[PDB]
Amino acid sequence: MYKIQLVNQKEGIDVTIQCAGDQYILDAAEEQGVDLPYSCRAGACSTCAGKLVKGSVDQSDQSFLDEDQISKGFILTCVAYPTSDCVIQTHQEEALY
Numbered sequence: 001m002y003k004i005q006l007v008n009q010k011e012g013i014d015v016t017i018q019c020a021g022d023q024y025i026l027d028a029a030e031e032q033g034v035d036l037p038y039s040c041r042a043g044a045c046s047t048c049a050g051k052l053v054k055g056s057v058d059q060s061d062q063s064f065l066d067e068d069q070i071s072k073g074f075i076l077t078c079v080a081y082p083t084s085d086c087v088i089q090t091h092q093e094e095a096l097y
């Protein structure tokens with residue numbers, strides 16, 4: 001399983017969880033007691049946006065983020081399967097706007 005560090009100083013989040021390659025990051029976090037934002041849970045909005053600081057994901061079901069947003073590291077945590085150990089900033093929807 002992948003090691004996923006989730007951070008947000010404003011929200012008081014600083015936790016590293018395990019996530020299998022076949023579970024989405026949001027779901028693994030919520031299963032482990034972490035309170036992350038989401039609404040559609042289907043990759044079609046920005047509510048669950050996070051930002052990769054390090055690592056990689058497979059978020060190929062996502063349908064919202066453009067190529068420049070992806071290039072900067074943004075991810076939709078509700079449809080992102082980890083493909084490496086990651087460090088992710090949570091609650092990053094503002095950084096898109």
Ligand code: FES
Nearest residue numbers: 039041043045078
């Ligand atoms: S909650 Fe809408 S894309 Fe993740």
